[PDB]
Design a protein around this ligand. Structure first.
Ligand code: YX1
Length: 584
């Protein structure tokens, strides 16, 4: 009957019937013409959900038809009747479920694979709704940049991330981690055989999930530009890129972010000569990607005009090259349309975004568990390439990455609160509501100086706390609000205790300290109410005992590595301790 949570939100979806049961043995049609990676993902889900494939057609089993446009499959034509992927952009597809048949038609092999992902999300206990779908991404490249400092993701983490990207229609992975010397301090050197297996698994997994594996190269550390030395180094760039191409890498990025030699013309000439002698000469290599030394608006622009570096770079760099920038700041609240307009005009092209959220490398005590927030819903006019920099914490990064998938696939309809809820619903199952309680307090990032981003922590709770102070200072009866807040604080503690008891270890290991912090803070919040209530009752002894606890709970939180709800659960105790009800 009803449609399950879907991610990304499909572009067009119509519920056209009451739904039906998928038979435990089905008819598979198109299995030989259709995209292999889509079929494998299909076979993989079918196996996992206890569904067998009929070796011969129809004891009136359910029929599943799969393939691409212009694929020679009439069964597909018939099941779709009226709806089609023919007029859809790259990566687009059509899905029709109706009266014992499911049709999956992609505009290309990527689209077929993505149709299979929607299919997998539509099925619940072998029931599927009857729908007509036509779907396609808002933005052409969507994904992750592995750009964070701190403990690296492991091999298994990366394999898991790649699968997750595929499942949420993210097609871009910029492999450029700090712990692989072959991407920076050993950039000249091809990978030795002792490393080829590990690299190949990543490349293979990526391909198989329709994820573009971008090899990030940072030659800035020691690259030479002039004379024989500069020629030798340019030749090493080629040989490196070839040797990766030989492994099946078809996407490359060259970073200029950490170079001392701030020479725009030298940077851009290397790019252009690489574009020509490598990217153009191979023919199946995707557009070149670069990060210029000036890569946030503040570094790039002064008084509406490009600074010298940016101006030279914009003027030299080939128009075919993708150029990354991080928005108005390195870590900032927003990218408004005007910022993307300004930078895109300077570079006379659609821009690539490197979004520094949920990354927490600059403020590691806190977990960034909120949605894409602050990004202009019209950014696609000036941007056709979107990536996020996630946390060293791979598992909990999925919450925010999940919302980036929705934002970049269906930008016009993105709603950060709804996407945030959906991400936690789809990821946490029976723990979703408890995980929301916790994550809600840990969305806002702010190092107090240059780095700030994300949705405010617990906005509703924060508004209730404000009303408490307003009522108490106005000598209005606050009895009912106090009871309500006791409810909120008990809920925070209970949720956090259930997460400690029941979160799978893969998630718990990333957040155990922050859970303990929020519990401490919730207990200090409760003691803070006890303080106020004592003052209302003129019970000096009850006031002193509540105050001692509130202060010790605050102090435990302030001294701990873990950071959470600074402006909300934490600040409330400080507000309560500075409040003097005896003088109102
Ligand atoms: C675009 N870019 N360098 O290529 C980038 O964002 N670099 C780092 C980025 O790697 C880091 O995670 C972030 C927060 O500390 O700071 C930035 O300066």
């Amino acid at each position: 009957v009803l449609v399950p949570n879907l991610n990304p939100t499909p572009e067009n979806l119509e519920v056209v019937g009451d739904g039906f049961k998928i038979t435990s043995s089905i008819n598979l049609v198109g299995e030989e013409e259709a995209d292999e990676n889509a079929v494998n993902a299909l076979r993989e889900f079918l196996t996992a959900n206890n569904i067998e494939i009929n070796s011969e057609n129809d004891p009136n089993s359910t029929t599943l038809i799969i393939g691409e446009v212009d694929d020679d499959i009439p069964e597909l034509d018939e099941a779709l009747n009226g709806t089609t992927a023919e007029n859809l952009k790259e990566e687009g597809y059509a899905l029709v479920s109706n009266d014992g048949k499911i049709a999956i038609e992609g505009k290309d092999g990527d689209g077929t694979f993505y149709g299979v992902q929607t299919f997998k999300q539509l099925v619940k206990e072998s029931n599927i709704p009857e729908v007509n779908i036509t779907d396609y991404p808002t933005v052409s490249a969507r994904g992750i940049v592995e750009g964070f400092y701190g403990t690296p993701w492991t091999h298994q983490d990366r394999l898991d991330q790649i699968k997750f990207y595929g499942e949420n229609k993210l097609n871009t992975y910029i492999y450029a981690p700090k712990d692989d010397p072959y991407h920076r301090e050993k950039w000249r050197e091809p990978y030795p055989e002792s490393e080829m297996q590990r690299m190949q698994e990543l490349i293979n997994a990526s391909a198989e999930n329709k994820v573009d594996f971008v090899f990030g190269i940072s030659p800035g550390i020691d690259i030479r530009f002039d004379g024989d030395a500069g020629e030798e180094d340019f030749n090493h760039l080629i040989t490196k890129a070839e040797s990766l191409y030989d492994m099946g890498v078809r996407s490359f990025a060259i970073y200029w972010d950490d170079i001392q030699d701030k020479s725009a013309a030298k940077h851009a000439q290397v790019l252009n000569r690489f574009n020509e002698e490598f990217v153009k000469a191979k023919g199946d290599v995707k557009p070149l990607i670069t990060v210029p030394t000036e890569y946030d608006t503040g570094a790039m622009v002064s008084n509406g005009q490009p600074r010298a570096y940016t101006r030279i770079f914009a003027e030299t760099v080939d128009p075919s090259i993708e150029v990354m920038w991080t928005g108005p700041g390195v870590v900032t609240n927003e990218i408004p349309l005007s910022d993307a307009q300004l930078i895109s005009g300077i570079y006379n092209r659609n821009m690539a975004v490197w979004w520094n959220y949920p990354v927490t490398d600059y403020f590691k005590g806190k977990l960034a568990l909120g949605p894409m927030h602050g990004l202009d819903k019209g950014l696609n006019q000036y941007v056709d390439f979107f990536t996020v920099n996630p946390m060293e914490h791979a598992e909990l990064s999925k919450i925010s990455i999940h919302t980036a998938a929705d934002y970049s696939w269906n930008m016009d309809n993105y709603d950060y609160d709804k996407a945030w809820n959906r991400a936690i619903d789809m990821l946490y199952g029976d723990l979703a509501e408890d995980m929301k309680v916790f994550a809600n307090h840990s969305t806002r990032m702010d190092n107090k100086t240059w780095a700030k981003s994300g949705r405010e922590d617990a906005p509703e709770l924060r508004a209730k706390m404000d009303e408490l102070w307003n009522k108490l200072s106005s000598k209005e009866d606050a009895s009912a609000l106090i009871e309500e807040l006791y409810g909120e604080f008990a809920r925070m503690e209970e949720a956090c205790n259930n997460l400690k008891a029941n979160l799978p270890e893969v998630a718990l290991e990333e957040c155990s300290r922050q859970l303990d912090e929020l519990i401490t803070l919730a207990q200090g919040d409760k003691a803070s109410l006890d303080m106020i209530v004592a003052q209302l009752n003129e019970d000096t002894e009850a006031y002193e005992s509540a105050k001692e606890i509130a202060q010790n709970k605050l102090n435990t939180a302030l001294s701990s590595f873990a950071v959470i709800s600074e402006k909300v659960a934490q600040s409330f105790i400080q507000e309560a301790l500075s409040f003097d009800l005896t003088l109102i």
